[PDB]
Amino acid sequence: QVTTEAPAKVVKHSKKQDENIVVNKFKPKEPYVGRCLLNTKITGDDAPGETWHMVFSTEGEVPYREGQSIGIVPDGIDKNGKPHKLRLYSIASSAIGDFGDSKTVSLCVKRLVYTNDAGEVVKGVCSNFLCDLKPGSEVKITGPVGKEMLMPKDPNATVIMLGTGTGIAPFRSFLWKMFFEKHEDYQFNGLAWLFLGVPTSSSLLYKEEFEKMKEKAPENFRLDFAVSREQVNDKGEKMYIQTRMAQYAEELWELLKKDNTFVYMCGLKGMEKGIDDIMVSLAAKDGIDWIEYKRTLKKAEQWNVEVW
Ligand SMILES: Cc1cc2nc3c(=O)[nH]c(=O)nc-3n(C[C@H](O)[C@H](O)[C@H](O)COP(=O)(O)OP(=O)(O)OC[C@H]3O[C@@H](n4cnc5c(N)ncnc54)[C@H](O)[C@@H]3O)c2cc1C
Ligand SMILES: NC(=O)c1ccc[n+]([C@@H]2O[C@H](COP(=O)([O-])OP(=O)(O)OC[C@H]3O[C@@H](n4cnc5c(N)ncnc54)[C@H](OP(=O)(O)O)[C@@H]3O)[C@@H](O)[C@H]2O)c1
């Protein structure tokens, strides 16, 4: 008698792809050092700001999956002569990545530039270090990190994706896996519906990639852009992400009632309310309380949010 079945720890059931998930492999103390293979501006010269897509080599060292983030420890020192604290960035590439070999990682980085009260133009530390990275240079990477935006296991589920600006990053990751890759253990066949809000057309992130997936899966991939400074509804209101969702209020409410519908929200801290505003009205008209309904959705792993 050499064996025993040690009693199992009690565990919550999960609908998301967390099987053998990896978080916090590399710490800022000793980050994985990769290199920059390419770094391109993906917004027009005309856009209000600059967003860049960049790919780093990882030689397979960083075991990330769709929906996770990696931290970056930007080179240099702060005003006190101290090395910089890491900043987190949602991975914009699928687990197999942009080269199909499972040895790289991609980011979608908005260059932060503003002017303080004093009137001085200020440059965010990490965002400007990253957008200025030249192919060949090293970059310090930490993580992976995150379990909140992991994709649902069900390959026939409906995945509604709501993102603003760079919040599109984990959705580019999910979609490459769903429409640009043939996975033996995962072939997607549900409905993938993407809503992206950006300020101008020159600001539309990965439009062309999204347009190829639509051309490749015209049935089950739906794409809706919400260009706030160029589009307007019948009332002349700026087309924000929730203003565009409102044009499909009936259909979305119906899917929200299906049990295999998972909703993901990523991007600006504020997008959150406009959406809830849109939701309460719908549920209301159906004699349902969004407050209560939302709770269930969240506990049911169907209303996933990651905003900054
Ligand atoms: C989980 C997670 C995922 C993220 N994903 C991404 C991503 O994919 N892409 C991306 O670009 N960002 C992402 N971020 C944000 C990112 O981590 C950094 O916060 C961002 O890049 C700015 O950092 P920085 O080092 O450039 O700026 P910092 O040097 O840290 O400066 C930021 C500070 O400047 C001030 N500030 C910022 N904006 C303004 C403004 N408009 N006016 C006045 N003061 C201001 C604030 O005090 C702020 O704390 C994510 C954040 C989190 C938490
Ligand atoms: N995992 C994460 O947590 C994660 C990942 C990626 C990014 N982010 C965060 O999300 C943000 C994306 O930054 P970004 O500069 O790329 O955004 P952005 O370019 O400034 O604008 C995004 C769009 O959202 C609009 N918008 C503003 N307020 C809104 C609201 N209340 N509801 C709906 N839409 C609204 C803007 O319209 P107007 O300009 O006309 O107002 C604009 O069209 C960053 O702050 C970043 O920190 C977080």
Cβ contacts of 248-252, under 8 Å, gap ≥ 24: 248/224, 249/278, 249/281, 249/282, 252/160, 252/282
Q: Whose CA is nearest to atom 10 of ligand 1?
A: 109
Q: Whose CA is nearest to atom 14 of ligand 2?
A: 165
Calpha distance 57→68 (Å, rounded): 17
Calpha distance 50→44 (Å, rounded): 8
Pairing of strands 87-90, 192-198: unpaired
Pairing of strands 87-90, 69-73: antiparallel
Q: Which two tokens stand for residue 134?
A: 């030249």
Q: Tell me yes or no: is domain 146-308 CATH 3.40.950.10.
A: no
Resolution (A): 2.0
Beta carbons of 168 and 265 less than 8 angstroms apart: no
Beta carbons of 164 and 85 less than 8 angstroms apart: no
- The number of the ligand nearest the C-alpha atom of 71 reads 1
Q: Beta-strand (E) ranges in 58-187? A: 69-73, 87-90, 104-110, 113-115, 121-123, 138-145, 158-164
Q: Which two tokens stand for residue 99?
A: 């080269």
Q: Is the CB of 71 under 6 A from ligand 2?
A: no
Calpha distance 195→104 (Å, rounded): 27
Q: What is the dihedral of CA 85, 91, 93, 96, to 10 degrees?
A: 90
Calpha distance 178→155 (Å, rounded): 9
Beta carbons of 108 and 172 less than 8 angstroms apart: yes
C-alpha R_g of the chain: 21
Beta carbons of 260 and 300 less than 8 angstroms apart: no
Domain with CATH 3.40.50.80 in the chain: 146-308
Domain with CATH 2.40.30.10 in the chain: 13-145
Ligand 1 pocket residues where CB is under 6 Å: 69, 87-90, 108-110, 112, 114, 124-127, 166, 169, 306, 308
Fold for 13-145, please state it. Answer: Elongation Factor Tu (Ef-tu); domain 3 (2.40.30)
